[PDB]
Design a protein around this nucleic acid. Structure first.
Lengths: 605, 48
RNA sequence: UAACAGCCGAGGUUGUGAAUUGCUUUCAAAAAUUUUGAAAAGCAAUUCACAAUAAGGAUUAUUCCGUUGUGAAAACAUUCAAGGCGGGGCAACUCGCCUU
């Protein structure tokens, strides 16, 4: 906000008029200051508020109504970092002098005053920048050397001998820029975090490396702010919509949404908005709140491809242009320009260049797009390749086209409408896709059917997994990636469990497979490890005949505290433990010189 | 049960970041020394 | 909710110099074993400037490695390909798209 007041002031309360707020048997007061300000929050205890000097950091925000909306927040002198920062900021500011000059003047007043860590600890870098520039531009006149060029080329060459590019770039500046923006105040940008982005689970690439093999590189996940991903999610939501009424609670859907025209109209209506909700969805069909619902939460809002609507709003705010500049290519280019260039000045340069290349006025477009919010850090499950492949299949109406589909999906569709037999077609396919008699029936498709049509696999069925010996387990242990769990404690516990099971299998199995028959897991915050350890250990005693299938083997039988304590008490194990641990207890009795640590019982004698 | 920097890697990263800041400051000082020497602004004994 | 990783800030501590003043001792003089004095050392206090801040090892790129895990190879994991369809700034650098 243009203000960023955050002003630290110390105000004394004059009087506390009773505000008549009787809550929980106590009436609250208000706060009045000499300047004419009131604390927004109420006051209960008057002992700490009457005629006391209270200091807060206050921010004034200009609301649309035309009056400041002052905020209040308690701060403490020399105890709060932000409070000390703001106090020093204001003390330098009202002096209208440089921070070094402020330190001087304080030294002038009191020679005993300590400077570092007490007087000025934390302030904005811009103050030091301002003072240092001022001194260099002042001294540059007197010293001819600061205006020379042979020395400025020599020093640039010394700094960047092996960098021709940076040498040539900097040969156009002055010594002030070198001292400020290239040496002292240069701060490196954040390291790229794209290296940790997850991989697409559908698209693979195969290539021959230098090691004489052929292995696969994965595709990085598409950003969730991608217009393709936004459109895909909007299409998913629009197709998933089923309506309900309030009188008889019947499924009124497929009546108001039967033909392709209604779905096309719903999509076109949702393009112009940013977030659909109950009221907008009901009004789109001229329905009402009192009579119908949309099968979901009546007070929740879902994303509605807000990027396109925001771009349209900005491109209408710039004005002085026709309503045809914005298109799919322009939207993608705008997304690339804003999301790619994550730096303020370079973002400004990119926006100016984008306004220059297109025949548009760069007067209000730059102002509209300079405050564009940086996109949220989130990435989808798949990539842009998968979404680009899948999107033609889902769309219906004029957005449904057979030409944009690639060779593989088109051939699979032709095979499934022909009814012939392919090695990639099962009876499940003909059961599910019996309604796809004609190639035109591939309208308004869903994620699962379109995914199988495109790639040829029905959802994620895992690979079950069976370990024929400890070789597989030790390979998996060697290939285990560090920091792949929530916390290090769990991962180290699991790793040591794997180590001990490997050792026991090696010893008591002597290299014989299937030596173990059943494995039981007891845990005793730590609850999430159960499913993971069951999934890991399923790969040993799984039964391959089909009588043991699923995410986890039926052989893995988790335990619980109830059965443990019941069997320990019933089977005499509690007595065994007690007699085993007694010797420490009579030693404790002997050292304590008391008999309280062991108590006799006659039921067990 | 609650968690407050409960990891060895956390303190390792803390120490590494502190060292990195120190090394950045030292590099800035080195570049300043080189620039000032090539401009001949330092005193004789200091540059010696 | 959390892991991991990255860009930066202000202290503190030890150490050098300096401004002021302290306590102890010895040289060191006067005076009545004792009081005062010149000097030196040891130990500090307050403030300012600077050095180091895990021992150490590279390098001259606006680069770094040194408190994590595995385990005998003192070996690694935490970097990891080829091009092309391109955009972004005065560029280095970075971000979208496609085939092996």
């Amino acid at each position: 906000e243009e203000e960023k007041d955050k002003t630290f002031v110390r105000l004394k309360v004059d009087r506390i008029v009773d505000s008549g707020e009787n809550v929980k048997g106590k009436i609250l007061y208000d706060v009045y200051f000499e300047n004419g300000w009131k604390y927004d929050k109420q006051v209960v205890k008057t002992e700490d508020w009457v005629d006391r000097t209270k200091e807060f950091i206050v921010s004034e925000s200009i609301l649309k109504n035309g009056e400041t909306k002052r905020t209040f927040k308690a701060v403490d002198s020399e105890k709060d970092w932000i409070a000390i920062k703001t106090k020093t900021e204001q003390e330098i500011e009202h002096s209208h002098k440089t921070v070094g000059t402020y330190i001087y003047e304080t030294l002038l007043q009191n020679p005993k005053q300590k400077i570092k860590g007490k007087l000025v600890r934390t302030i904005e870098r811009k103050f030091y920048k301002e003072e240092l520039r001022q001194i260099l531009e002042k001294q540059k006149e007197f010293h001819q050397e600061l205006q020379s060029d042979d020395l400025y080329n020599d020093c640039i060459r010394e700094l960047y001998r092996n960098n021709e590019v940076h040498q040539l770039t900097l040969r156009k500046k002055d010594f002030v820029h070198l001292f400020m923006e290239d040496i002292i105040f240069y701060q490196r940008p954040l390291r790229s975090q794209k290296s940790s982005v997850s991989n697409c689970t559908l698209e693979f690439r195969k290539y021959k490396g230098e090691n004489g093999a052929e292995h696969t590189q994965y595709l990085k996940a598409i950003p969730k702010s991608n217009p393709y991903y936004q459109e895909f999610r909007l299409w998913q939501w629009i197709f998933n919509l089923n309506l309900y009424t309030k009188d008889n609670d019947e499924n009124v859907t497929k009546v108001f949404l039967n033909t392709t025209q209604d779905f096309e109209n719903l999509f076109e209506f949702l393009n112009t908005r940013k977030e659909v909700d109950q009221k907008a969805l009901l009004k789109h069909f001229k329905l009402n709140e009192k009579t119908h619902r949309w099968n979901f939460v009546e007070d929740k809002k879902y994303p509605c491809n807000e990027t396109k609507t925001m771009i349209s709003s900005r491109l209408d705010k710039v004005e002085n242009i026709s309503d045809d500049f914005l298109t799919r290519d322009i939207e993608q280019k705008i997304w690339h320009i804003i999301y790619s260039v994550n730096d303020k000045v370079e973002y400004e340069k990119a926006l100016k260049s984008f306004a220059r290349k297109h025949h548009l006025d760069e007067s209000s477009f730059f102002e509209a797009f300079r405050k564009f919010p940086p996109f949220k850090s989130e990435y989808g499950s798949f990539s842009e390749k998968a979404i680009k492949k899948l999107l033609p299949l889902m769309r219906l109406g004029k957005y449904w086209n057979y030409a944009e589909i690639d060779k593989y999906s088109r051939e699979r569709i032709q095979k499934i409408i022909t009814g012939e037999y392919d090695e990639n077609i099962k009876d499940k396919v003909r059961e599910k896709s019996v309604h796809l008699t004609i190639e035109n029936d591939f309208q308004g498709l869903q994620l699962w059917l379109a995914q199988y049509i495109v790639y040829g696999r029905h959802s994620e069925a895992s690979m079950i997994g069976k370990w024929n010996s400890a070789n597989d387990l030790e390979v998996f242990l060697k290939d285990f990636k560090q920091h792949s769990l929530r916390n290090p404690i769990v991962e180290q516990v699991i790793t040591e469990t794997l180590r001990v099971v490997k050792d026991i299998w090696l010893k008591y199995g002597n290299g014989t497979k299937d030596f173990f028959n059943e494995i039981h897991i007891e845990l005793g915050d730590t609850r999430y490890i159960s499913k993971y350890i069951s999934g890991i250990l399923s790969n040993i005693v799984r039964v391959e005949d089909g009588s043991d299938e699923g995410v986890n083997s039926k052989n893995i039988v988790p335990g619980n505290g109830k059965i443990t304590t019941q069997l320990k008490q019933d089977w005499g194990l509690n007595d065994v433990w007690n007699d085993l641990i007694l010797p420490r207890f009579e030693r404790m009795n002997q050292l304590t010189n008391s008999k309280d640590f062991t108590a006799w019982n006659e039921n067990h004698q | 049960g609650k968690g407050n920097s409960v990891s060895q890697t956390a303190e390792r990263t803390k120490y590494r970041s502190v060292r990195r800041l120190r090394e950045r400051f030292l590099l800035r000082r080195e570049r300043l020394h080189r620039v000032l020497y090539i401009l001949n602004f330092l005193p004789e004994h200091y540059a010696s």
